[PDB]
């Protein structure tokens, strides 16, 4: 978009492409094409009747927008 054109003059691009079939993958992983990233919003909570933390976690990760089996790293 017209913004990318202002951006490119600074050395910045927002291209983020995954080499794989079907799957997205994480920003900074090797073999991605492009120097940018795409993001999105997930908020979920599941009610279920260290391990404690882990199984309810997976339950929220596979609830709705699927991000199951990901090696989550944190930024803040």
């Amino acid at each position: 978009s017209e913004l990318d054109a202002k951006l490119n003059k600074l050395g910045v691009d927002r291209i983020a492409i995954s080499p794989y079939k079907q799957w997205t993958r994480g920003y900074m992983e090797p073999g991605n094409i492009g120097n940018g990233y795409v993001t999105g919003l997930k908020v979920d909570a599941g009610v279920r009747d260290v391990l404690d933390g882990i199984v309810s976690y997976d339950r929220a990760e596979t609830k709705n927008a699927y991000i199951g089996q990901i090696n989550m790293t944190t930024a803040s």
Partner: protein, 229 residues
Amino acid sequence: XFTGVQGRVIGYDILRSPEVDKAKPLFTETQWDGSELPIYDAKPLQDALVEYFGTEQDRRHYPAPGSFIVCANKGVTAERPKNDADMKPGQGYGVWSAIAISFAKDPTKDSSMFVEDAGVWETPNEDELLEYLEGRRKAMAKSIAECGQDAHASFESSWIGFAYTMMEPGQIGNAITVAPYVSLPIDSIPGGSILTPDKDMEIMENLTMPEWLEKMGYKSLSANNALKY
């Protein structure tokens, strides 16, 4: 968190939801320059990510098994005891999470920001919690507006949304808020190619979420608000 000069947000910048332009602001909060930053419910955007990754059951362009996705995330977990209706205090009846994205007015100078929060609920009245959540919103707006002035970053909108649960009976509850940072596969891009990277991004930012679905042969997983958080 942040999304700056390198980023785009699903549902807004690429694969935009009709719901987004049709959205009406829940209210406005003032910020350091004297602009009324409108505040919106993030439901378009949240549903949007479900269309793209899909669900456990309708798996679409979700992250690769074992991939390393850096995310902006917060979580929280709590028990609501067996009968023992006395909360030894890391305990509670309900649990919630929240996320806000505030789009920078000038994405060349300033970053867009994400704010995410989470806690437990010390009461059993679901409705009482709800009242509280719409309070937390205006609080987050204030945290956005404080932060805005910290870096003299005026924003142009904010989109905030929540999910939660009301546990009972020794069922443990976990609420997570997370903004993932991904790169898109070619087979998600209608007519894209591993040799046309920059055009690929322009296809996605030029499609609406309905067009993207129609062209991918994908049934809308939201449409008549079918998605719960």
